[PDB]
Amino acid sequence: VYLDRKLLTLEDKELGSGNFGTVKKGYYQMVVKTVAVKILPALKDELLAEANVMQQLDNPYIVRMIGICEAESWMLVMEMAELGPLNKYLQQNRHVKDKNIIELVHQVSMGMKYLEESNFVHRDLAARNVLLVTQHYAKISDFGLSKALRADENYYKAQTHGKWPVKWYAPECINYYKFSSKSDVWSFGVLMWEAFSYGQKPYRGMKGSEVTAMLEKGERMGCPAGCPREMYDLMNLCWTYDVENRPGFAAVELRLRNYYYDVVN
Ligand SMILES: CCOc1cc2nc(-c3[nH]ncc3NC(=O)N(CC)CC)[nH]c2cc1F
Protein backbone atom coordinates (compact mmCIF):
# COMPACT_ATOMS: atom_id res chain seq x y z
CA VAL A 1 0.00 0.00 0.00
CA TYR A 2 2.74 2.52 0.96
CA LEU A 3 4.90 3.37 -2.09
CA ASP A 4 8.47 4.75 -2.38
CA ARG A 5 8.62 8.37 -3.72
CA LYS A 6 12.14 7.68 -5.16
CA LEU A 7 10.62 4.96 -7.42
CA LEU A 8 7.86 7.40 -8.61
CA THR A 9 8.58 9.79 -11.53
CA LEU A 10 5.85 12.44 -12.12
CA GLU A 11 5.39 14.02 -15.59
CA ASP A 12 4.37 17.66 -16.39
CA LYS A 13 1.30 16.40 -18.38
CA GLU A 14 -2.03 16.61 -16.48
CA LEU A 15 -4.62 13.90 -17.33
CA GLY A 16 -7.53 15.42 -15.35
CA SER A 17 -8.69 17.93 -12.70
CA GLY A 18 -11.30 18.32 -9.92
CA ASN A 19 -12.02 19.76 -6.43
CA PHE A 20 -9.29 17.47 -4.92
CA GLY A 21 -6.59 18.91 -7.23
CA THR A 22 -5.29 17.12 -10.36
CA VAL A 23 -4.57 13.69 -11.99
CA LYS A 24 -1.09 13.39 -13.62
CA LYS A 25 0.82 10.82 -15.76
CA GLY A 26 3.74 9.03 -14.08
CA TYR A 27 6.15 6.06 -13.95
CA TYR A 28 6.71 3.58 -11.08
CA GLN A 29 9.59 1.04 -10.82
CA MET A 30 8.35 -2.54 -10.11
CA VAL A 31 10.07 -3.41 -15.15
CA VAL A 32 8.65 0.17 -15.02
CA LYS A 33 4.84 0.71 -14.94
CA THR A 34 3.09 3.76 -16.49
CA VAL A 35 0.72 5.19 -13.87
CA ALA A 36 -2.02 7.81 -13.35
CA VAL A 37 -1.44 9.68 -10.08
CA LYS A 38 -4.34 11.42 -8.26
CA ILE A 39 -2.65 14.38 -6.44
CA LEU A 40 -4.48 16.23 -3.60
CA PRO A 41 -7.96 17.24 6.48
CA ALA A 42 -11.28 16.48 4.66
CA LEU A 43 -9.66 15.88 1.20
CA LYS A 44 -6.88 13.70 2.78
CA ASP A 45 -9.41 11.44 4.63
CA GLU A 46 -11.44 11.18 1.36
CA LEU A 47 -8.33 9.97 -0.58
CA LEU A 48 -7.40 7.43 2.19
CA ALA A 49 -11.00 6.01 2.17
CA GLU A 50 -10.92 5.90 -1.70
CA ALA A 51 -7.61 3.94 -1.54
CA ASN A 52 -9.05 1.48 1.06
CA VAL A 53 -11.98 0.67 -1.31
CA MET A 54 -9.73 0.22 -4.43
CA GLN A 55 -7.26 -2.06 -2.51
CA GLN A 56 -10.13 -4.55 -1.80
CA LEU A 57 -11.09 -4.77 -5.52
CA ASP A 58 -9.62 -7.37 -7.93
CA ASN A 59 -11.40 -7.44 -11.32
CA PRO A 60 -10.18 -6.94 -14.96
CA TYR A 61 -12.90 -4.29 -15.56
CA ILE A 62 -11.91 -2.05 -12.59
CA VAL A 63 -8.86 0.32 -12.48
CA ARG A 64 -6.23 -1.26 -10.17
CA MET A 65 -4.60 0.83 -7.44
CA ILE A 66 -0.78 0.44 -7.23
CA GLY A 67 -0.70 2.14 -3.82
CA ILE A 68 -0.48 5.45 -1.94
CA CYS A 69 2.41 7.92 -1.41
CA GLU A 70 2.88 10.84 1.04
CA ALA A 71 5.29 13.53 -0.21
CA GLU A 72 4.73 17.14 -1.53
CA SER A 73 0.97 16.19 -1.39
CA TRP A 74 -1.06 12.98 -0.69
CA MET A 75 -1.01 10.71 -3.79
CA LEU A 76 -3.25 7.87 -5.07
CA VAL A 77 -1.26 5.83 -7.66
CA MET A 78 -3.36 3.82 -10.19
CA GLU A 79 -2.63 1.75 -13.34
CA MET A 80 -2.70 3.89 -16.52
CA ALA A 81 -5.65 3.53 -18.94
CA GLU A 82 -4.01 5.22 -21.98
CA LEU A 83 -7.10 6.05 -24.10
CA GLY A 84 -8.80 7.87 -21.18
CA PRO A 85 -12.46 8.68 -20.40
CA LEU A 86 -15.14 6.96 -22.56
CA ASN A 87 -17.19 10.19 -23.07
CA LYS A 88 -14.15 12.17 -24.41
CA TYR A 89 -13.01 9.24 -26.62
CA LEU A 90 -16.46 8.84 -28.28
CA GLN A 91 -16.65 12.66 -28.80
CA GLN A 92 -13.29 12.45 -30.71
CA ASN A 93 -14.12 9.13 -32.47
CA ARG A 94 -17.72 9.41 -33.83
CA HIS A 95 -17.08 6.54 -36.34
CA VAL A 96 -16.81 3.91 -33.50
CA LYS A 97 -19.12 0.97 -34.46
CA ASP A 98 -22.33 0.14 -32.54
CA LYS A 99 -20.94 -3.42 -31.86
CA ASN A 100 -17.85 -1.78 -30.19
CA ILE A 101 -20.14 0.37 -27.94
CA ILE A 102 -22.13 -2.75 -26.80
CA GLU A 103 -18.76 -4.50 -26.09
CA LEU A 104 -17.46 -1.63 -23.85
CA VAL A 105 -20.86 -1.15 -22.09
CA HIS A 106 -21.00 -4.95 -21.42
CA GLN A 107 -17.46 -4.79 -19.91
CA VAL A 108 -18.70 -2.04 -17.48
CA SER A 109 -21.69 -4.29 -16.50
CA MET A 110 -19.23 -7.19 -15.81
CA GLY A 111 -17.16 -4.88 -13.55
CA MET A 112 -20.35 -3.58 -11.87
CA LYS A 113 -21.63 -7.19 -11.40
CA TYR A 114 -18.41 -7.94 -9.41
CA LEU A 115 -18.83 -4.65 -7.41
CA GLU A 116 -22.45 -5.73 -6.58
CA GLU A 117 -21.17 -9.22 -5.45
CA SER A 118 -18.39 -7.48 -3.40
CA ASN A 119 -21.17 -5.38 -1.69
CA PHE A 120 -19.67 -2.02 -2.75
CA VAL A 121 -21.64 0.96 -4.11
CA HIS A 122 -19.93 3.13 -6.77
CA ARG A 123 -22.07 6.34 -6.36
CA ASP A 124 -20.39 8.05 -9.40
CA LEU A 125 -21.02 5.64 -12.31
CA ALA A 126 -20.78 7.88 -15.42
CA ALA A 127 -19.14 7.74 -18.91
CA ARG A 128 -16.39 10.18 -17.71
CA ASN A 129 -15.43 7.56 -15.04
CA VAL A 130 -15.13 4.67 -17.55
CA LEU A 131 -11.55 4.57 -18.82
CA LEU A 132 -10.26 2.85 -21.94
CA VAL A 133 -7.11 0.68 -21.98
CA THR A 134 -7.75 0.02 -25.73
CA GLN A 135 -10.72 0.67 -28.11
CA HIS A 136 -11.99 -2.83 -26.98
CA TYR A 137 -11.08 -2.73 -23.22
CA ALA A 138 -12.95 -0.59 -20.62
CA LYS A 139 -12.30 -0.22 -16.85
CA ILE A 140 -14.32 1.51 -14.09
CA SER A 141 -12.52 4.32 -12.19
CA ASP A 142 -13.15 7.18 -9.66
CA PHE A 143 -14.04 5.53 -6.33
CA GLY A 144 -14.07 8.91 -4.50
CA LEU A 145 -17.78 8.65 -3.57
CA SER A 146 -17.74 4.80 -3.25
CA LYS A 147 -18.82 3.06 -0.01
CA ALA A 148 -18.38 -0.42 1.48
CA LEU A 149 -21.90 -1.59 2.45
CA ARG A 150 -22.63 -2.69 6.04
CA ALA A 151 -23.03 -6.47 6.58
CA ASP A 152 -26.65 -5.90 7.80
CA GLU A 153 -27.66 -3.32 5.09
CA ASN A 154 -28.16 -3.47 1.28
CA TYR A 155 -27.85 0.36 1.00
CA TYR A 156 -25.68 3.32 2.14
CA LYS A 157 -27.47 6.22 3.89
CA ALA A 158 -25.86 9.64 3.32
CA GLN A 159 -26.27 12.09 6.26
CA THR A 160 -26.04 15.21 4.01
CA HIS A 161 -26.57 16.03 0.28
CA GLY A 162 -23.04 16.85 -0.93
CA LYS A 163 -21.59 17.78 -4.37
CA TRP A 164 -23.63 15.13 -6.22
CA PRO A 165 -23.83 14.11 -9.92
CA VAL A 166 -27.68 14.36 -9.76
CA LYS A 167 -28.25 13.60 -13.50
CA TRP A 168 -26.84 10.07 -12.88
CA TYR A 169 -28.74 9.52 -9.58
CA ALA A 170 -31.78 7.27 -9.04
CA PRO A 171 -34.97 8.78 -7.42
CA GLU A 172 -34.31 7.03 -4.03
CA CYS A 173 -30.87 8.80 -3.90
CA ILE A 174 -32.49 12.26 -4.38
CA ASN A 175 -35.60 11.57 -2.21
CA TYR A 176 -34.24 9.37 0.65
CA TYR A 177 -30.36 9.64 0.35
CA LYS A 178 -30.31 5.80 -0.07
CA PHE A 179 -27.57 4.33 -2.31
CA SER A 180 -27.70 0.63 -3.27
CA SER A 181 -26.28 -1.54 -6.12
CA LYS A 182 -29.68 -1.01 -7.84
CA SER A 183 -29.00 2.79 -7.54
CA ASP A 184 -25.77 2.15 -9.55
CA VAL A 185 -28.01 0.26 -12.10
CA TRP A 186 -29.92 3.56 -12.73
CA SER A 187 -26.53 5.35 -13.22
CA PHE A 188 -25.54 2.51 -15.62
CA GLY A 189 -28.67 3.27 -17.70
CA VAL A 190 -27.56 6.94 -17.99
CA LEU A 191 -24.00 5.67 -18.80
CA MET A 192 -25.52 3.47 -21.60
CA TRP A 193 -27.37 6.54 -23.02
CA GLU A 194 -24.08 8.57 -22.94
CA ALA A 195 -22.15 5.77 -24.73
CA PHE A 196 -24.77 5.33 -27.51
CA SER A 197 -25.02 9.20 -27.80
CA TYR A 198 -21.20 9.32 -28.47
CA GLY A 199 -20.24 11.13 -25.24
CA GLN A 200 -23.13 13.64 -25.31
CA LYS A 201 -24.15 15.05 -21.89
CA PRO A 202 -27.45 13.62 -20.49
CA TYR A 203 -30.51 15.89 -19.90
CA ARG A 204 -28.86 18.80 -21.82
CA GLY A 205 -29.92 22.37 -20.94
CA MET A 206 -31.80 21.09 -17.85
CA LYS A 207 -31.36 21.87 -14.12
CA GLY A 208 -31.15 19.09 -11.49
CA SER A 209 -34.64 20.00 -10.17
CA GLU A 210 -36.02 19.91 -13.78
CA VAL A 211 -34.57 16.34 -14.22
CA THR A 212 -36.29 15.22 -10.93
CA ALA A 213 -39.58 16.79 -12.20
CA MET A 214 -39.13 15.02 -15.61
CA LEU A 215 -38.56 11.54 -14.03
CA GLU A 216 -41.57 12.06 -11.66
CA LYS A 217 -43.81 12.60 -14.77
CA GLY A 218 -42.54 9.16 -15.88
CA GLU A 219 -40.54 10.76 -18.71
CA ARG A 220 -37.16 9.37 -19.83
CA MET A 221 -34.46 10.46 -22.34
CA GLY A 222 -35.20 9.56 -25.98
CA CYS A 223 -33.48 6.84 -28.02
CA PRO A 224 -30.04 7.96 -29.36
CA ALA A 225 -29.49 7.94 -33.17
CA GLY A 226 -28.44 4.46 -34.37
CA CYS A 227 -28.95 2.85 -30.93
CA PRO A 228 -30.66 -0.60 -31.20
CA ARG A 229 -34.19 -1.06 -29.76
CA GLU A 230 -32.97 -3.89 -27.41
CA MET A 231 -30.27 -1.56 -25.95
CA TYR A 232 -32.78 1.31 -25.41
CA ASP A 233 -35.17 -1.23 -23.77
CA LEU A 234 -32.35 -2.11 -21.28
CA MET A 235 -31.72 1.67 -20.61
CA ASN A 236 -35.45 2.02 -19.73
CA LEU A 237 -35.34 -1.16 -17.57
CA CYS A 238 -32.33 0.40 -15.71
CA TRP A 239 -34.56 3.53 -15.39
CA THR A 240 -37.27 1.66 -13.36
CA TYR A 241 -38.46 4.19 -10.70
CA ASP A 242 -39.20 1.58 -7.95
CA VAL A 243 -36.02 -0.05 -6.50
CA GLU A 244 -37.68 -3.51 -5.93
CA ASN A 245 -38.75 -3.85 -9.61
CA ARG A 246 -35.42 -2.48 -11.00
CA PRO A 247 -33.00 -5.30 -12.10
CA GLY A 248 -29.66 -6.00 -10.40
CA PHE A 249 -26.29 -6.11 -12.19
CA ALA A 250 -26.45 -9.93 -12.74
CA ALA A 251 -29.68 -9.49 -14.82
CA VAL A 252 -28.28 -6.35 -16.61
CA GLU A 253 -24.94 -8.08 -17.51
CA LEU A 254 -26.75 -11.25 -18.81
CA ARG A 255 -29.01 -9.15 -21.13
CA LEU A 256 -25.91 -7.31 -22.49
CA ARG A 257 -23.93 -10.61 -22.77
CA ASN A 258 -26.71 -12.29 -24.84
CA TYR A 259 -27.28 -9.24 -27.09
CA TYR A 260 -23.52 -8.72 -27.72
CA TYR A 261 -23.08 -12.37 -28.84
CA ASP A 262 -26.20 -12.02 -31.10
CA VAL A 263 -24.51 -9.05 -32.90
CA VAL A 264 -21.07 -10.85 -33.00
CA ASN A 265 -22.63 -13.98 -34.63
C1 LIG B 1 -4.96 10.73 -24.35
C2 LIG B 1 -4.86 10.42 -22.86
O1 LIG B 1 -6.03 10.97 -22.24
C3 LIG B 1 -6.25 10.63 -20.94
C4 LIG B 1 -5.85 9.39 -20.42
C5 LIG B 1 -6.14 9.07 -19.09
N1 LIG B 1 -5.89 7.99 -18.34
C6 LIG B 1 -6.38 8.21 -17.11
C7 LIG B 1 -6.32 7.31 -16.05
N2 LIG B 1 -5.74 6.12 -15.98
N3 LIG B 1 -5.93 5.62 -14.86
C8 LIG B 1 -6.65 6.44 -14.08
C9 LIG B 1 -6.91 7.52 -14.81
N4 LIG B 1 -7.65 8.59 -14.48
C10 LIG B 1 -8.67 8.65 -13.60
O2 LIG B 1 -8.99 7.69 -12.90
N5 LIG B 1 -9.30 9.82 -13.49
C11 LIG B 1 -10.41 10.00 -12.53
C12 LIG B 1 -11.70 9.42 -13.12
C13 LIG B 1 -8.94 10.99 -14.31
C14 LIG B 1 -9.90 11.09 -15.50
N6 LIG B 1 -6.93 9.42 -17.08
C15 LIG B 1 -6.81 9.98 -18.28
C16 LIG B 1 -7.22 11.21 -18.80
C17 LIG B 1 -6.94 11.53 -20.12
F1 LIG B 1 -7.32 12.72 -20.62
Curated annotation (Swiss-Prot):
Every copy of the Protein kinase domain together lies at 9-261
Q: Which residues carry this modification: Phosphoserine?
A: S17, S209
Q: Tell me, how does this one assemble? A: Interacts with LYN; phosphorylates SYK. Interacts with RHOH (phosphorylated); regulates mast cells activation. Interacts with NFAM1 (phosphorylated); probably involved in BCR signaling. Interacts with VAV1 (via SH2 domain); phosphorylates VAV1 upon BCR activation. Interacts with GAB2 (phosphorylated); probably involved in IgE Fc receptor signaling. Interacts (via its SH2 domains) with CD79A (via its phosphorylated ITAM domain); the interaction stimulates SYK autophosphorylation and activation. Interacts with FCRL3.
Recorded domain comment: The SH2 domains mediate the interaction of SYK with the phosphorylated ITAM domains of transmembrane proteins. Some proteins like CLEC1B have a partial ITAM domain (also called hemITAM) containing a single YxxL motif. The interaction with SYK requires CLEC1B homodimerization.
Q: How is it modified after translation?
A: Ubiquitinated by CBLB after BCR activation; which promotes proteasomal degradation. Autophosphorylated. Phosphorylated on tyrosine residues by LYN following receptors engagement. Phosphorylated on tyrosine residues in response to IL15.
Q: Which residues carry this modification: Phosphothreonine?
A: T22, T160, T212
Where do the catalytic residues lie?
Answer: D124
Its biological purpose: Non-receptor tyrosine kinase which mediates signal transduction downstream of a variety of transmembrane receptors including classical immunoreceptors like the B-cell receptor (BCR). Regulates several biological processes including innate and adaptive immunity, cell adhesion, osteoclast maturation, platelet activation and vascular development. Assembles into signaling complexes with activated receptors at the plasma membrane via interaction between its SH2 domains and the receptor tyrosine-phosphorylated ITAM domains.
What is the organism field in this record? Homo sapiens
Tissue specificity, in the record's words, reads: Widely expressed in hematopoietic cells (at protein level). Expressed in neutrophils (at protein level). Within the B-cell compartment, expressed from pro- and pre-B cells to plasma cells.
* Cellular localization per UniProt: Cell membrane; Cytoplasm, Cytosol
Q: This chain belongs to which protein, by name? A: Tyrosine-protein kinase SYK
Q: State the similarity comment.
A: Belongs to the protein kinase superfamily. Tyr protein kinase family. SYK/ZAP-70 subfamily.
Cysteine pairings via disulfide bonds: none
Please give the residue positions where the record annotates the modification Phosphotyrosine.
Y2, Y114, Y137, Y155, Y156, Y176, Y259, Y260, Y261
